[PDB]
Write a protein that binds this DNA or RNA. Structure first.
Lengths: 72, 72
DNA sequence: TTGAGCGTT
DNA sequence: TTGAGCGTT
């Protein structure tokens, strides 16, 4: 389980931006942003341990609090 | 401003544990835990950028959500 | 605040 | 859910 769900994304948050933000924690291998805009994203890590360490956290991306959960 | 306040600490959270947890983000140079127990701590980073990136986040340490704020 | 497309045990 | 101690512009 190396994919996380990222809730409360804003529309200006691009895949590049999310990847740049999330790769601070470990290698990111994919980002999925729904189209049309649905205010969430999925971020996939190479390492399971990295994804699990983020679950349950609320992180600040460009001043916005996003919630991290397991991807199902 | 390279020091953060860590709110909602639990008593079992030792200085070593907090340092181990927080050094994932960057070099940690000090940890202060009040005695007697007051359910918060201060963590000092070598790098200001690291402290600022954490402010406003809620992080999970041993299953517990702690809130990160600027140290004043 | 839980996604696709290909193409079928 | 905002700390010490040393020792004084």
């Amino acid at each position: 389980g190396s994919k996380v769900f990222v809730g409360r994304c804003t529309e200006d948050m691009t895949a590049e931006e999310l990847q740049q933000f999330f790769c601070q924690y470990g290698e990111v291998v994919d980002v999925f942003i729904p189209k049309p805009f649905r205010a969430f994203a999925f971020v996939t890590f190479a390492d399971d341990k990295v994804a699990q360490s983020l679950c349950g956290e609320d992180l600040i991306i460009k001043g916005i609090s996003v919630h991290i959960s397991n991807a199902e």
